[PDB]
Structure 1
Amino acid sequence: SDGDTAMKAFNDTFWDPNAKMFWKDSKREKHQDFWVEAELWELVMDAYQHTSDPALKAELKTQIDDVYDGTVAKYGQDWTNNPFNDDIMWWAMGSARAYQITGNPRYLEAARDHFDFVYDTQWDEEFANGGIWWLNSDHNTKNACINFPAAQAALYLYDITKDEHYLNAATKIFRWGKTMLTDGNGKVFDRIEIEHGAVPDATHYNQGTYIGSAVGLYKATGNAVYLDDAVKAAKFTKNHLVDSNGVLNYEGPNGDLKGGKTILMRNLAHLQKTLDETGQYPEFSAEFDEWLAFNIEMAWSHQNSDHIVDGNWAGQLGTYESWSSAAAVQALNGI
């Protein structure tokens, strides 16, 4: 469908061309959190790939560079002092994508140096036979929100570099996460803690990065089991993390989860594209396409007069937030 109207509205409402960052909300008092800015960077990249408007395309090309420059101006070039390994990995993954799109070597160095720091210092086999720690300050839990994004980042690095080290990393992370952070049936657990074990709370963004890593590992290897793993996690999402009418849930008020549909929709588009160009899971592909279209139309129907959609897609039409509002824009820029 049209993703151009939604992307331009999002930029008009939230982009700060002075700081080269998105505002956190329409009160324009604070810029977006560090990790979420990486996900809005990926949204700009997805809209760049989706649009057929050469004017908007050229604007988004410049914006891909600006989002990086604005974050580096505030946080510096070296993010390895951030205690959240997931914050570092969201940026390493965005930087890998920026290189795939542009070939600007600065984005390969940012991706590789941040990925290497996390994988080389935060992968551990002492606890639970594998997995990356959530934090580099304290080691108490290993989480879906670092492990699956790390597998995805390693798969982008393998595509760019052809260095089998990165496919090895992706495979080891994903196999460990499938074993320790899922039920084997498509449900992705939040985390596994040293004292209390697995925490089997499922969320949009952890289903999403699991599906994206499984699809990426299917594309790298040709092994149909990884695509089956992705389809099971997609089916779980469609059958559990929805309301009684099939609309994806609103996961607020938690600020990190409120915009999680953005990451889910990005990765569900990857799966849709792979099913469409392979003839895999034909009955599911048709039902998946109908359910995605239903959700995207519900989101479209929830737009305000400025073409901004808050994250409560099933609810009635205040201050708008860039992370909650990103999910509809992503949904309309599927690649």
Structure 2
Amino acid sequence: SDGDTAMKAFNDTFWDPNAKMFWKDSKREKHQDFWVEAELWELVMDAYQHTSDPALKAELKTQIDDVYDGTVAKYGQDWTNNPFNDDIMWWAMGSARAYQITGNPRYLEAARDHFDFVYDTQWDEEFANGGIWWLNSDHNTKNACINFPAAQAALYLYDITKDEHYLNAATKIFRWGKTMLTDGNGKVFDRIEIEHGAVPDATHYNQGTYIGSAVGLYKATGNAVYLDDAVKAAKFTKNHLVDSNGVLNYEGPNGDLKGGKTILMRNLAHLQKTLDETGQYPEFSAEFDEWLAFNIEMAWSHQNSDHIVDGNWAGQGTYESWSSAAAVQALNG
């Protein structure tokens, strides 16, 4: 029931049925940013997968289509005019997932066409020995927020198509990212800037997409090193991106980072499932599961009377859809 209650409340508060987009906040004066809307799209999909209520499930399935339609009405179907490669990839990944749920051809075409644009034209071997550029306008930085999502998108496309091209892409992207965008022990760096080098600033959403791509690669390849990779990044997160009580911390005021627990929780659930199922890392798995449950209970204990939880999970007017999404995500894992 809790995942259902959380998603229903989130939609009540933030879904605009007229524009078929989420509102950016409860003042209902601006719709959500393009990239973030893909992440809310995935939240709808996660609720769809999680729920056991057939009425709600059908409504959510329709909503999957409506989110795409509202975005296409405002932004078009061809996102390759957007200078942000990450923006394109977040939508390509969401589209791959929407295809898996609905079977609608438009989503497979969207996923494959946009993934190909970014991977085939924005990968470069010269600077930093590999990696995808953040932007398709200026080529000054290669970032975790494009590279790990690209590996994830490739893994979904591999699953759908069985075309080894996509598994090879995921493997290549992830190898580069582990080598150049992490410390080797689970701390994921934000980016590498040309003429500077690595910027070793870790954040929830980049831990998350690293963990999700590692878990996906473990499953696709049968190579246990990838599971180990995921575990080390989860451990880092649990010990180093938390407050003194172990609650995942608040990354405001940056608007993009504020809601990043949403992406983190989505991907921590993949690891949780794989550890639970396989029985690997049983000691860590038990600790991890207890810590996840603790975080979820603390976050929800801060819900307001409308069952909305602000993204500072350590505390208490206007609520924002990105920051409020993480608590909903956490109950739909």
Q: Residue 80 of structure 1: SS of its match in structure 2?
A: helix
1:159-196 alpha-carbon deviations (Å, 9 max, x no partner): 00000000010000000000000000000000011111
Q: Indicate whether 1:311 and 2:311 are aligned.
A: yes
Q: What is the Cα deviation at residue 104 of structure 1?
A: 1.4
Q: Distance in 2 between matches of 1:193 and 1:300?
A: 38
Give deviations 1:81-127, integer Å, cap 9, x for gaps. Answer: 00000000000000000111122111000000000000001000011
Provide the rounded CA distance (Å) in 2 between the counterparts of 1:234 and 1:171: 20
Structure 1: stretches of 5+ with no match in the other structure: none
What residue number does 1:250 align with?
Answer: 250
Task: State the Cα distance separating 1:128 from its structure 2 match.
Answer: 1.0
Corresponding residue of 1:12: 12
Name the CA distance, whole Å, in 2 between partners of 1:33 and 1:242. Answer: 26
State the distance in 1 between where 2:191 and 2:58 align: 40
Deviation at 1:310, TM superposition (A): 0.4
Residues 209-246 of structure 1 deviation map (CA, whole Å, 9 limit, x = unaligned) = 00000000001001000000000000000000000000
CA distance in 2, matches of 1:101, 1:250: 32
Provide the identity percentage: 100
- Give 1:312 shift: 0.6
**Per-residue deviation, residues 265-285 of structure 1 (Å, max 9, x unmatched):** 000000000001101100000
RMSD: 0.6
State the distance in 2 between where 1:123 and 1:103 align: 29
Listed one character per residue, the Cα deviations across residues 135-164 of structure 1 (whole Å, up to 9, x for unaligned) are 000001000000000000000000000000
CA shift, 1:2, in A, is 1.8
Distance 1:232 1:7 in 2: 31
Moved over 2 A (4+): none
Aligned residues, how many?
333
SS of the residue 1:131 aligns to: coil
User: What SS class does the counterpart of residue 192 from structure 1 fall into?
Assistant: strand
Q: Which runs of 5+ in 2 are unaligned?
A: none
Question: Quick one: distance in 2 between partners of 1:330 and 1:209?
Answer: 15
Q: CA deviation at 1:302?
A: 0.6
Task: Give me the whole-angstrom Cα distance separating, in 1, the residues matched to 2:96 and 2:276.
Answer: 25
1:52-96 per-residue CA deviation (whole Å, 9 max, x = no partner) reads: 011110100000000000000000000000000000000000000
SS of 1:198 mapped into structure 2: strand
> SS of the residue aligned with 1:159?
helix
Shift of residue 311, structure 1, vs aligned partner: 0.1
Q: Distance in 2 between matches of 1:75 and 1:255?
A: 21
Distance, in Å, in 2 between the alignment partners of 1:5 and 1:279 is 31
What's the CA shift string for 1:20-47, capped at 9, x where partnerless?
0000000000100000000000000000
Question: Matched residues in 2 for 1:315 and 1:2: separation?
Answer: 20
